[PDB]
Amino acid sequence: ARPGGDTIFGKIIRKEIPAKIIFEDDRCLAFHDISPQAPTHFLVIPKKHISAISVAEDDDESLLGHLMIVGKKCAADLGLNKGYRMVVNEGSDGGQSVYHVHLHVLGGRQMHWPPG
Amino acid sequence: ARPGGDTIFGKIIRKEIPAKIIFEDDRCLAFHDISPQAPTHFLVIPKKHISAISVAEDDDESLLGHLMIVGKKCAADLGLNKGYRMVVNEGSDGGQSVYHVHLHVLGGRQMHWPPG
Numbered sequence: 726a727r728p729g730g731d732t733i734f735g736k737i738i739r740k741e742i743p744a745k746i747i748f749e750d751d752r753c754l755a756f757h758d759i760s761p762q763a764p765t766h767f768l769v770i771p772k773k774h775i776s777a778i779s780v781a782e783d784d785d786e787s788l789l790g791h792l793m794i795v796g797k798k799c800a801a802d803l804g805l806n807k808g809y810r811m812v813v814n815e816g817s818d819g820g821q822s823v824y825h826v827h828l829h830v831l832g833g834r835q836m837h838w839p840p841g
Numbered sequence: 842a843r844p845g846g847d848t849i850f851g852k853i854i855r856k857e858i859p860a861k862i863i864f865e866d867d868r869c870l871a872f873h874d875i876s877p878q879a880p881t882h883f884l885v886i887p888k889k890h891i892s893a894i895s896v897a898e899d900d901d902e903s904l905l906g907h908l909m910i911v912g913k914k915c916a917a918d919l920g921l922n923k924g925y926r927m928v929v930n931e932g933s934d935g936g937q938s939v940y941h942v943h944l945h946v947l948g949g950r951q952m953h954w955p956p957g
């Protein structure tokens with residue numbers, strides 16, 4: 726139980742591997758996605774290991790909302806004036822991919838509907 | 842100003858328009874979207890009128906987390922045990938359809954990448 730958990734996200738948090746870090750505070754970390762689906766695609770993750778949104782606790786409320794505030798602030802810092810889409814994925818149907826909560830922020834192009 | 846605001850979502854919050862309500866507390870409402878893009882497709886909106894995520898105050902961090910906590914409990918009470926996708930749309934490039942903050946929860950099918 727190392728601080729930041731046992732996923733590849735734990736390695737980014739403990740600075741064991743480099744990443745394109747846009748923002749860091751004592752609660753979270755935001756960085757550019759390796760496989761960008763939009764001219765701007767970044768991730769906001771908590772430093773606390775929550776394996777899935779499905780198992781977040783009621784008192785993680787503040788932390789989850791902070792991810793969104795940091796997502797919206799980083800979107801403004803990067804010049805996303807025409808808008809953006811935020812995404813949280815759970816499980817197989819969601820395409821969660823990694824067992825650590827993350828918020829996607831995408832913009833720089835028109836996003837379409839449905840959202841996949 | 843009136844309780845819940847001057848959008849279509851205000852009318853829902855004051856029970857002027859019908860919605861099938863999944864969940865209600867003093868801070869938010871969850872109900873089925875009437876243009877569903879998945880076998881399950883519901884919204885969680887704050888009872889407080891924030892026009893868009895891009896104009897959310899740091900005073901709104903707790904409420905934003907609350908939307909995602911109620912989002913994941915509703916998904917579980919509706920039986921989305923294979924997963925789901927949570928979306929917030931900001932502005933023109935994000936396809937924001939209503940100027941009142943809303944969380945989409947979609948499930949009951951495989952969601953694809955990219956998410957629009």
Ligand SMILES: C[As](C)(=O)[O-]
Pocket residue numbers: 874875876938939
């Ligand atoms: C009917 As809608 C709020 O999913 O654009």
